[PDB]
Ligand binder design. Sequence first.
Ligand SMILES: *C/C=C1/C(=C/c2[nH]c(/C=C3[NH+]=C(/C=C4\NC(=O)C(C=C)=C4C)C(C)=C\3CCC(=O)O)c(CCC(=O)O)c2C)NC(=O)[C@H]1C
Ligand SMILES: *C/C=C1/C(=C/c2[nH]c(/C=C3[NH+]=C(/C=C4\NC(=O)C(C=C)=C4C)C(C)=C\3CCC(=O)O)c(CCC(=O)O)c2C)NC(=O)[C@H]1C
Lengths: 313, 315
Amino acid sequence: PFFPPLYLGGPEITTENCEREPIHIPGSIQPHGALLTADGHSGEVLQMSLNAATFLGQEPTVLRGQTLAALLPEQWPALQAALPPGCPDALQYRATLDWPAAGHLSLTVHRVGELLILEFEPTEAPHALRNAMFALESAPNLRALAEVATQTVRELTGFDRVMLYKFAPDATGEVIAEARREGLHAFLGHRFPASDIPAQARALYTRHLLRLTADTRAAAVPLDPVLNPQTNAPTPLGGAVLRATSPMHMQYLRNMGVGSSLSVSVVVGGQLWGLIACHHQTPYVLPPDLRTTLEYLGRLLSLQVQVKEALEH
Amino acid sequence: DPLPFFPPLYLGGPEITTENCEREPIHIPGSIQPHGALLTADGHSGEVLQMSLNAATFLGQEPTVLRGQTLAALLPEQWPALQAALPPGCPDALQYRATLDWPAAGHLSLTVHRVGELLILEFEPTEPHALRNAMFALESAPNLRALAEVATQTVRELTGFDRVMLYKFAPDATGEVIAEARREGLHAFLGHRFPASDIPAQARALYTRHLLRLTADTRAAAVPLDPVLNPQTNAPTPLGGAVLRATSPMHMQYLRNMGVGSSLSVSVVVGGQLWGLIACHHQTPYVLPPDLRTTLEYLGRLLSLQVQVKEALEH
Ligand SMILES: *C/C=C1/C(=C/c2[nH]c(/C=C3[NH+]=C(/C=C4\NC(=O)C(C=C)=C4C)C(C)=C\3CCC(=O)O)c(CCC(=O)O)c2C)NC(=O)[C@H]1C
Ligand SMILES: *C/C=C1/C(=C/c2[nH]c(/C=C3[NH+]=C(/C=C4\NC(=O)C(C=C)=C4C)C(C)=C\3CCC(=O)O)c(CCC(=O)O)c2C)NC(=O)[C@H]1C
């Protein structure tokens, strides 16, 4: 099972109880964006991130009463249709708001039971994706496919180090390709134990396919209230990209000298086959539209991995 | 009975009838559709060899000036990028795309691929979260039918086509419409089946390799390449990879009988075989710009993956 989270007086995590940390319910978010939760029917804002005032430019209490209908007039009917009751928590709807306080915000929404989870992040506003897609497809074998994928992602993102990390049958890991800035250690061909990505994280990653930590030294921002009013229980934030990262993981990134990190799932036959893995030596918020490109690439790689593995077997 | 290609018409090949269908050489028509222009160039020197007859009017230069310059001089910013992206020996399926600002012609989309020692250059005029939203909706579709319906409706919304269908292949190459989204007033084709000679065998071979093809005007006359044969080989120029390549006169007559002015389609390739087609009809001529066509290419790949996934959930 899982331990209770800290804020419900659960035990603090060690290297003895890795598999029992409730990574999906930390009740907080990374501070480069803002999150609201809201009732599926009324559009009533139930929780907000204590930083919401910044991004939204709204007097704190104003929000926690108001309705999405009021708050987002053009958007609220779209949400209603895009995310019908009973849909999966994996389904997401996005829009760009030209919002008074902040030039442009990206809005990402999904639904968990009766709750809508809304994420706001700064945003903005060519052929590299089309060119990459054809390059992946003409790679003659799995090895070359791995090389093209990591190089392509590095070129699109500027990440110092981009790896393709593959999963063995006992969840043991291997770096099979890597493109990196001059003057980093080379991790190509190294293997890592099966606890370095624990059992509960490998399930979330079969389902939600992108996650990132934009700054491995930044403090999480609590949800207020922390518990969902509807349930008097923790909000599942597993589908949220601004979800706060486990403190056990941020400690590991700093021991490596990493300031920013991102990864995309490669899912084949309903199982987690590998990850496109990205390091950055300093903090780095990749904007939503560039993340989308890596989400597409994740699907394309999932297709090509199967194609390529079939022409060996 | 499978039979090897006839020589094309311009090399004295016989004209094509319901009797000799499977033997037309569709990949070497020696002409293109008139809404874009095409050049061929030597893959090492960049010497310009062939051009479509309409090239002067897209590129704003006399044919003889064009032919007198290398791509290094014509495309100084793109020539080195081309050479890196399309190395000798690469497959004919690999494409490189760029946008050019051309003086006379506005923004042109440039699409390049390599066939042996020949570079093929296609030029066409070019012009929010709909794709991302569609990707997630496709993945959340509960079964094959719902996937097919979401896919057809999405493509129709993105493109404005009169009719968008998911065409599915049977083992005998007979086909069937398993879903469609159509303009009000059109007669449904949902659930109709059609014989195996409605897409002959040399065309199914080609659609496993090149994944998107189109006819913007089913009454427009093709534009010849000049000269018609590749001067490197004194042989036909393979335009299998070229989306601007002219369409077989056989197939353009069928569309006119159907009252279609414009057609487009994307392959769904599963396990190395042609699983089906995302097919779009329009009653009048209709050019879909290159960047919108890219969205359909991406959806073709997504749908190939999701079809595998939905079918595996089915035994
Ligand atoms: C006792 C618990 C420990 C633990 C927990 C933990 N780890 C993750 C996630 C990841 N761990 C990864 C491991 C590696 N990263 C690398 O760069 C390399 C090799 C060069 C390895 C072997 C990776 C890649 C992830 C993915 C996450 C990401 O994209 O940033 C979590 C999950 C956190 C979450 O927010 O869901 C947890 C709880 N890691 C340990 O090493 C032990 C001590
Ligand atoms: C003896 C020659 C014939 C012939 C030739 C032919 N057909 C194609 C390609 C296609 N034919 C299609 C047939 C259909 N169109 C529809 O709308 C429906 C049903 C709703 C069917 C069954 C289709 C879909 C294609 C693919 C391309 C497209 O969608 O437009 C070719 C290939 C052309 C080329 O690659 O240049 C050829 C030569 N078809 C016949 O029926 C006989 C008379």
